[PDB]
Design a binder for these strands. Structure first.
Lengths: 39, 63, 28, 145, 143, 63, 11, 205, 125, 213, 50, 40, 91, 49, 51
RNA sequence: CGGAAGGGCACCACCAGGAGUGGAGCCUGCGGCGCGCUACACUGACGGAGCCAGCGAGACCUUGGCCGAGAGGUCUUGGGAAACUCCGUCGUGCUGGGGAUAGAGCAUUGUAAUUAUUGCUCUUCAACGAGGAAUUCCUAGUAAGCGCAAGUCAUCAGCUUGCGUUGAUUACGUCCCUGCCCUUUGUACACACCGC
């Protein structure tokens, strides 16, 4: 029966994923903080 | 409900007990209405099978 | 108008309830 | 999106409808498995209801509740009023060897009235007895309006 | 006794009339009948690429005649189904006005339809006679 | 296997039974005398038939 | 703790 | 009010709260529940006998309750009303459930079988329908708009044939075989129908 | 004039107006014959009153039905309600009331919601 | 001998009504194809719970069979089978699809076995209905299985549920369709094949009941 | 990394629902007496799981 | 700049302590509004 | 109040509780004498039974349930103008 | 404003970003006609609306 | 009025009055080997080349 | 202060089921917790054809004509939604389910920074193989599916609120368990029942 190897712990796709995830987290965090201060 | 629940084997046992009280008259005259109410209700409930059965000892008990 | 249509009361009986192109115009 | 924000009550033999906006909701499901509500006929508490509007609201909510509770009824619903933002809480209380001690339970939310229509909520054309005015000059200062 | 496509079913009449136009041949199909997707919301051009134009011709004829006059915009609104946005919800999309215009122009060339005042394309008398003839034919298709 | 039929005579309410399980007096469809206090699971009413695999035992309580 | 009917039956 | 017929005295004069006028009445077969149907409230009030205070105000009609009765084996109650409806309530045993049956016109008389399976209801068109309760279905109706001998009035302006003054039956009762029906209204006739063949047996003036 | 009689069938939101008159015996729905109704499975659900009562009465009777509103199933139920109401109304009016009662009995012994509407009004618990 | 003559003119209609429709007015069948006579329940204790008496054309009467407690028993059997068939997330509210699948299934059943498709269906239900079930006595902690009997309404409900769930599972991700796999399941349950999901489930339930009776 | 299947599946409990129909269910108990594994598998039936 | 409507008040420890103290006073007094039953 | 009993009761109040005034109030007949004539011809009814005398002070609930008698030509032309006749009810 | 309904309007060309609109949100606003208002929430898909 | 014929991974049913391709069975993988109707005229069996 | 007995109620209980959340992707309120949407295909995907609603009436929408595969633009007039039904292709393969990502091209909008955005065409075909521990809600025109409209002082704009369409399985009993409540002076008036 054919053996297999699991992965555990694309480069530019990973980089754009990291970039947009960071932008999402940053935008949401700063909008929350700004709204709370304005209120 | 507690009288309606029990099967006919316990019904026949009930009638044997009632005959024993009729022998022991003083308990009967102590508790005449309770005995009569339970007996009339149990025979009205299990009337069909009791008249369907055939038992000469049950005939003498009922007499 | 919406209030009146809400209270129409549909049993009202009023007695009124018992009733070329230029060539076409001229003919009519 | 899952957060309750509006609550409209209507009395049914052509009675009034109050539309509240409820904001700061916290549920028992939101808190914890804590047991269950005692469900006994509850006592009522109303704080800082002054004007005729406050009388209307306290009468409406009073008759939503149940009439003629027991003296030793255990749970009490509180309706606090603090500048047009009424807040409700469930509270059980026992009389100690010296005083009282309450436990906060139930939901937890601030509601605020913004309409009181005369007819029932089917109509959307009935007369308005009171209407919250938002774009007026004294909107951020006027209480019970 | 005199019947019509009101009295005849939709699918069988459309198939019979498309086959009649196929065997007649005088329709002048355009050159691009095998690349066109018939809609933007579709996914592939039609399967039977030989006579789907003929089925469209028959269906447009039947639709006009059951109605009275229609524009190419009305036929686009009729034939355009909903699309698949994928990640988003779905919505409505109109049909292909180029194919609708080619169908109506070819039918006007044959003479089944004609132009219509107030603007439009109405059914012609000779074409109506031919439609009733083929409707009687598919009624008596059971011999 | 020989199975037997039995018709429900009387549902026996107010017995302390487990939820969903009902206690029911049945009678033998063959011989109209014998009545047995059996147990049922599904929704039951009077005068419907019901199949028994063993006739001798009778269903007692379930706490 | 039994039920009536049951205690009657065992007695 | 509730009369004895051995001591001849009231027990309890049941009422509502607002002194509302009761038209129709119905009693439990065992004698524990008393239902009364008014006309200005269209809510069947239900009192318990031995306590005296009212149990419940059964609501669910639209327009006044025209007749009430209890089928006396299952102890269910039919309520017929000018909503063009019959409403079969079962009120015992945790359920409090309702079975609404529609009819063609305004109903105004009701009776149930002595077995307690069917309900005859005489409506305003003159048909006497007969319904099966357990299915809430229609076993069938008997026409009555022909065999009614209405009278003419001395102050009339029309005929006694084309007048719908008393063209229906405001009172029904069964037989105690469940096989006949007497029907009487504002007319001058008392009709005796037979149910399984659905045809009148007699008409008295 | 010509003896005519108009009835209405009403499912959820499907109105079905039905005109009935004496004629050659044709049953037409929306200008089409009744043998070409839409969902192609409920065609027998709409043939139900005809085959219940027989075909001679409809051989004597002309029928025109028009239908508005409601989806497919609702429209089919409205059509059959309008047909049964129209047929028993025409029979009540222009022929014998005994045949009216026979028709009413047959229809209401098969399915009562042929004649009278089943308005499924709500209820609380 | 004695005859009754109740038709005097040959009936003709101005709209052409087909011959299959005229044979239906001779006798109501199912889908104008399957007769309802000689379709009897081959076992007592389930008649007046599986209803096949009152005839029906298509299985789409939308009657209120959910108000009282046994209108499900008053329902026809095929309408109940179709209702239980249209049971998934993706399938909620597609009764025309249920009717089409059932019509195709009845065709396949009659084609394989020529007896009668509805007779096969009724015999399958009567066979695959379970007979004894083990409830779970808590015992204050010792969860044990105690054998009790089962009401026939529950037997019919569980038979229909077992058959439909077995067919749906057999054609979830398989080359067969629901129609032919349900025909397969119904024929196997009619035979008592013990190769079908419902017969295996019923057998295992009755086995556990016989064990800890 | 073959991207063909999930290999280690955390499934819903229990083993009895994720177990075959006809089976024999044994537990190694040290105090229990000694059996022979090959004679055991040969004395088991044909379509069983162990 | 300026605002247009009342800001929704955030619940804090001080105001909830004040509120539970108000309820403590009300209960200790046993003086609170209820819908008492109608007499007669 | 009781002052409404000592003053508010009028001949005008009882004569407006009269039947043809109620019919004109409910807009059944356009004029009061037309309401009278319809009551004479026998085209109205109150609840179950129909009414022939105009001097009939209608009660509250019964004026709530007043209507035309069925199968009368006036209700027929009502439903004809509304184009909603239904001869199953022989309206 | 570039899109209006009854009592509501979508306003553009006043800020540059959703951060700015969130900084100014809850505002007693008014128009040349003399009707009052408030900015309510930052629109998502355009940058400043 | 019809007859079936085997062909390259395909079973084709023709009519007689039209002599046209009425039905096409193409669910196969490799070329079919036999096609035979039943006596009831409803089922055809198709022997394929996979066993 | 505590117990006992009798009785009622409850999808916070039992019983029978259904449908979700938690796994993937997208979106969004809370700071890891939570809410919606799409998928994982054959009760399907795709292509033709059929067609049935309701709520709504403060340089704009438009009927029609033209050309353009489409997107669109052009010239003229006044102030009927999807699921669904039928026929046909595909067939069990992460395959044609899926459409993330990427590339190229075509047009629209603002504007002038070769700026941003929208829609269409072709190519590229990722995760997803029915979702653990657990958890929630629900008993009839209900659960679920499907679209349409409007934003009418609070709340909402990859959303709220109405509206129509399709429409089920399973309990409708029991206090056995988990709770909650009531009573332990018939008080009230006949017959009956009970009697610290």
């Amino acid at each position: 029966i054919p053996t297999h190897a699991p992965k555990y712990e694309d480069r530019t796709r990973s980089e754009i994923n990291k970039m947009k995830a960071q932008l999402k987290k940053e935008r949401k965090f700063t909008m929350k903080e700004i709204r709370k201060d304005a209120k | 409900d507690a009288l309606m629940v029990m099967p006919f084997s316990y019904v026949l046992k009930f009638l044997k007990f009632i005959d024993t009280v009729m022998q022991n008259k003083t308990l009967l005259h102590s508790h005449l209405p309770l005995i009569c109410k339970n007996l009339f209700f149990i025979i009205k409930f299990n009337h069909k099978e009791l008249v369907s059965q055939k038992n000469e000892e049950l005939k003498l008990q009922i007499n | 108008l919406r209030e009146k249509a809400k209270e129409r009361n549909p049993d009202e009986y009023y007695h009124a309830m018992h009733s070329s192109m230029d060539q076409v115009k001229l003919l009519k | 999106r899952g957060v309750p924000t509006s609550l409209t009550i209507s009395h049914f033999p052509h009675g009034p409808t109050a539309q509240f906006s409820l904001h700061n909701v916290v549920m028992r499901h939101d808190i914890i498995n804590a047991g269950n509500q005692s469900e006994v006929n509850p006592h009522l508490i109303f704080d800082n209801f002054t004007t005729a509007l406050g009388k209307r609201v306290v009468c409406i909510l009073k008759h939503l509740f149940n009439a003629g509770p027991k003296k030793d009824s255990e749970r009490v619903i509180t309706f606090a009023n603090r500048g047009d933002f009424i807040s409700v809480r469930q509270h059980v209380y026992v009389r100690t060897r010296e005083g009282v001690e309450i436990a906060e339970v139930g939901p937890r939310f601030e509601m605020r009235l913004f309409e009181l229509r005369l007819g029932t909520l089917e109509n959307k054309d009935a007369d308005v007895e009171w209407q919250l005015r938002r774009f007026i000059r004294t909107a951020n200062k006027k209480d019970y309006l | 006794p005199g019947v019509s496509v009101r009295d005849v079913a939709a699918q069988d009449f459309i198939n019979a009339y498309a086959s009649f136009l196929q065997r007649q041949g005088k329709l002048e199909v355009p050159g691009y009948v095998d690349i066109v997707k018939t809609s933007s919301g579709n996914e592939m051009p039609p399967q039977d690429a030989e006579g789907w134009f003929y089925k469209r011709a028959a269906s447009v004829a039947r639709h006009i005649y059951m109605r009275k006059q229609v524009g190419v915009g009305k036929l686009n609104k009729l034939y355009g189904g909903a699309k698949s946005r994928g990640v988003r919800p779905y919505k409505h999309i109109d049909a292909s006005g180029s194919i609708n215009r080619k169908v109506l122009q070819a039918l006007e060339k044959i003479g089944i339809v004609e132009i219509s005042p107030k603007g439009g394309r109405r059914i012609s008398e000779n074409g109506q006679r031919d439609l009733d003839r083929i409707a009687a034919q598919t009624l008596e298709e059971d011999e | 296997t020989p199975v037997t039929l039995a018709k429900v005579i009387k549902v026996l309410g107010r017995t302390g039974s487990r939820g969903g399980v009902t206690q029911v007096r049945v009678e033998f469809l063959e011989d109209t005398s014998r009545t047995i206090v059996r147990n049922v699971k599904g929704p039951v009413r009077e005068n419907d038939i019901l199949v028994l695999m063993e006739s001798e035992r009778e269903a007692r309580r379930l706490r | 703790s039994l039920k009536a009917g049951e205690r009657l039956m065992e007695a | 009010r509730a009369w004895d017929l051995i001591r001849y005295r009231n027990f309890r004069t049941f009422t509502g709260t607002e002194r509302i006028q009761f038209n129709c009445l119905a009693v439990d077969p065992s004698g524990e529940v008393v239902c009364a149907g008014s006309l200005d409230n269209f809510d069947i009030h239900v009192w318990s006998v031995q306590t005296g205070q009212l149990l419940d105000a059964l609501s669910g009609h639209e327009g006044p309750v025209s007749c009430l009765s209890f089928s006396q084996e299952n102890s269910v109650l039919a309520s017929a009303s000018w909503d063009k409806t019959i409403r079969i309530w079962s009120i015992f045993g945790r359920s409090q459930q309702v079975e609404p049956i529609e009819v063609y016109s305004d109903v105004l008389a009701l009776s149930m079988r002595p077995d307690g399976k069917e309900v005859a209801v005489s409506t305003l068109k003159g048909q006497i329908s007969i319904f099966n309760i357990e299915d809430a279905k229609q076993v069938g109706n008997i026409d009555c708009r022909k065999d009614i001998i209405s009278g003419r009035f001395n102050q009339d302006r029309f005929t006694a044939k084309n007048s719908e003054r008393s063209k229906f039956f405001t009172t029904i009762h069964y037989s105690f075989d469940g096989m006949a029906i007497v029907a009487g209204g504002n007319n001058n006739s008392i009709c005796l129908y037979d149910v399984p063949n659905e045809v009148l047996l007699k008409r008295f003036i | 004039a010509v003896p005519s009689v108009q009835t209405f069938g009403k499912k959820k939101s499907a109105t079905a107006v039905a005109h009935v008159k004496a004629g050659k015996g044709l049953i037409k729905v929306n200008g089409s014959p009744i043998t070409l109704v839409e969902p192609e499975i409920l065609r027998f659900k709409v043939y139900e009153p005809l085959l219940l009562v027989g075909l001679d009465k409809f051989s004597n009777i002309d029928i025109r039905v028009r239908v508005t509103g409601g989806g497919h199933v609702s429209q089919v139920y409205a059509i059959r309600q309008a047909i049964a109401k129209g047929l028993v109304a025409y029979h009540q009016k222009y022929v014998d009331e005994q045949s009216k009662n026979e028709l009413k009995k047959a229809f209401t012994s098969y399915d009562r919601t042929l004649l009278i509407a089943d308005s499924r009004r709500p209820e609380p618990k | 001998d004695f005859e009754v003559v109740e038709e005097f003119t040959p009936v003709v209609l101005a709209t052409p009504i087909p011959e299959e429709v005229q044979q239906a007015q001779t006798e109501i069948k199912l889908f104008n194809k399957w007769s309802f006579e000689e379709v009897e329940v081959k076992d007592a204790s389930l008649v007046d719970y599986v209803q096949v008496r009152q005839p029906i054309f298509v299985a789409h009467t939308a009657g209120r069979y959910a108000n009282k407690r046994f209108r499900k028993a008053q329902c026809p059997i095929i309408e109940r089978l179709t209702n239980s068939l249209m049971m998934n997330g993706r399938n909620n509210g597609k009764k025309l699809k249920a009717v089409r699948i059932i019509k195709h299934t009845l065709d396949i059943i009659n084609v394989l076995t020529d007896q009668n498709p509805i007779q096969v269906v009724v015999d399958a239900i009567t066979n695959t209905g379970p007979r004894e079930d083990t409830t779970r006595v808590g015992g204050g902690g010792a969860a044990r299985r105690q054998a009790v009997d089962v009401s026939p309404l529950r037997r019919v409900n569980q038979a229909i549920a077992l058959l439909t769930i077995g067919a749906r599972e057999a054609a979830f991700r398989n080359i067969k369709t629901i129609a032919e796999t349900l025909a397969e399941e119904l024929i196997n349950a009619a035979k008592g094949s013990s190769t079908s999901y419902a017969i295996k489930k019923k057998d295992e339930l009755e086995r556990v009941a016989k064990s800890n009776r | 990394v073959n991207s063909e299947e999930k290999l280690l599946k955390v499934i819903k409990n229990p083993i009895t629902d994720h177990l075959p129909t006809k089976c024999r269910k044994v537990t190694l108990s040290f105090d229990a007496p000694v059996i022979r594994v090959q004679d055991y598998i040969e004395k088991l039936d044909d379509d069983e799981s162990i | 700049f300026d605002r247009t409507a009342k800001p929704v008040p955030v619940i804090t420890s001080e105001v909830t302590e004040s509120l539970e103290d108000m309820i403590r006073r009300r209960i200790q007094d046993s003086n609170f509004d209820d819908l008492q039953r109608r007499t007669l | 109040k009781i002052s409404d009993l000592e003053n508010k009761v009028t001949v005008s109040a009882i004569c407006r509780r009269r039947l043809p005034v109620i019919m004109h109030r409910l807009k059944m007949a356009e004029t009061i004498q037309d309401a009278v004539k319809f009551i004479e011809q026998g085209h109205v009814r109150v609840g179950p039974n129909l009414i022939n005398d105009p001097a009939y002070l209608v009660t509250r609930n019964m004026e709530d349930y007043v209507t035309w008698v069925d199968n009368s030509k006036i209700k027929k032309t009502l439903l004809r103008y509304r184009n909603q006749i239904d001869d199953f009810d022989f309206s | 404003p570039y899109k209006i309904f009854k009592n509501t309007a979508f306003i553009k060309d006043m800020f540059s970003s959703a951060m700015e609109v969130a900084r100014f949100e809850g505002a007693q606003i008014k128009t040349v006609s003399g009707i009052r208002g408030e900015i309510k929430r930052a629109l998502s898909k355009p940058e400043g609306h | 009025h019809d007859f079936a014929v085997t062909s390259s991974t395909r079973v084709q049913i023709f009519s007689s009055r039209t002599r046209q391709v009425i039905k096409t069975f193409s669910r196969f993988k490799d070329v079919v080997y036999s096609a035979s109707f039943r006596s009831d005229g409803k089922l055809l069996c198709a022997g394929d080349a996979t066993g």
